[PDB]
Amino acid sequence: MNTVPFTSAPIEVTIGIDQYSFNVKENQPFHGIKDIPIGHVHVIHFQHADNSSMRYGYWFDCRMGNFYIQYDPKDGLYKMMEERDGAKFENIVHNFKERQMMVSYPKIDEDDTWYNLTEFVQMDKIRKIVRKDENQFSYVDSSMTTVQENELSDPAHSLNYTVINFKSREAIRPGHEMEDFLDKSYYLNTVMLQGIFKNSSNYFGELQFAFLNAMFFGNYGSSLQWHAMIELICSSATVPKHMLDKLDEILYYQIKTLPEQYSDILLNERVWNICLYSSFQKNSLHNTEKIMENKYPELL
Amino acid sequence: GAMNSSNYAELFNNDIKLFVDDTNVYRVTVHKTFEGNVATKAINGCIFTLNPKTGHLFLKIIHTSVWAGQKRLSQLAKWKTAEEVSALVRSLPKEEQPKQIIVTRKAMLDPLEVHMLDFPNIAIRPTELRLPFSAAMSIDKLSDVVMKATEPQMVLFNIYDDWLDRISSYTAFSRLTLLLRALKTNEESAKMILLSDPTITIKSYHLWPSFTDEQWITIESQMRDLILTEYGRKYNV
């Protein structure tokens, strides 16, 4: 179990760690988060009390380094940093644990939610979507645009998700126009899986990462990407059987975790009604269809 | 965006454009089987691709053999239409290719867009107007060439005959729309109007009769009248 210490908490802020959150008052004696489970990526995220504008946060993996948080009063935000001096970091953390100034990552032992939301998410792949190679951790916020969004404007601050566009030459073989538009199996299996992602794990990882950025930061372009990657699978007549069963599990836990009052903005009516009721895979998502019908019947 | 009453004059500017109507591409006669079921038999159809400014009509005849052994024909018909329009554009010299293609039915947008991916600078547009282009098969010479076809064929016409020698394309296109509206609303009476007088003939190289300017005024008047004679008979007014 690993620890992310906080220098201090100089402004009032709601702090999130994965699906957990807590409120910290102005200058409250908060010095970080302990007992973070090893083996998964994590995201620490922030919403200031005074300006709920700009949710922002950091994806990180405690296996890759010792990371801490420090408020910057010039740039006005909590920044993640890496400590290169190991004995300094241990002496800092140990002092903070002794004075009990840290919250405990509050994982229930039965509970596999975070694993199921991040099963295919790797730090190495996050760092290629979010390019800032001098850090081991990745910053994301509410306003960052995706490469595809910037085609339709600052490149360094972009989410480089894989561009998916159903009316594009990449998606449509010359002479297979109708076939490829109405059955996207070519585009899914050859262009994207064999060509770009290499395997279904990397595809699902990007899909899961897009969802988490949509949910935790309200990132609109991440939501577009998540829905596009669902739709590409559901609109393919030919999908490996293991991918369909895994997809049902992936979506089930995403829909299960979504705050009930954010569905109006985070869920695209057309995509879900097409995916669940009209597409080739209308019958392949039993778990997702059951939870969607019992939890968001209005959208449908 | 969409083509409507507000931007009607854009039809007659000097940017090349084409309308595409797919109404008459897939044509069937529904009938009873010996077992008392219902079946369709296809008949030859056509794509109606027309330039508003010049009157040039690219009539691609769709022979019934294109449907043989195919499923979901009404869907296929839209993609076949889009394939043939794309082929037509590719066959034209660059300086003759359209800058815009206006489809009369919105279900043609995605099929045509996908087939025209190679032409990112050709705008594909819908229209809010309810044009009577379906009535093209009420023009006797167009109907005759379609039904006689034994194989796929493209036939070129000028749907305005020689009218542009005397009137603008705005009036030429507006005259074509009024004649087609009449043929769609009551074909028999419309055709009676156009041919009642044995002394006005259709030239071999034309589609419509050789009316004088004064006679066209009269002819347009009975068509405007006929579209009201029907609209009353229809709504009781």
Ligand SMILES: CC(=O)c1ccc(O)cc1
């Ligand atoms: C089609 C038609 O009847 C018509 C009439 C007047 C116009 O100025 C334009 C079109």
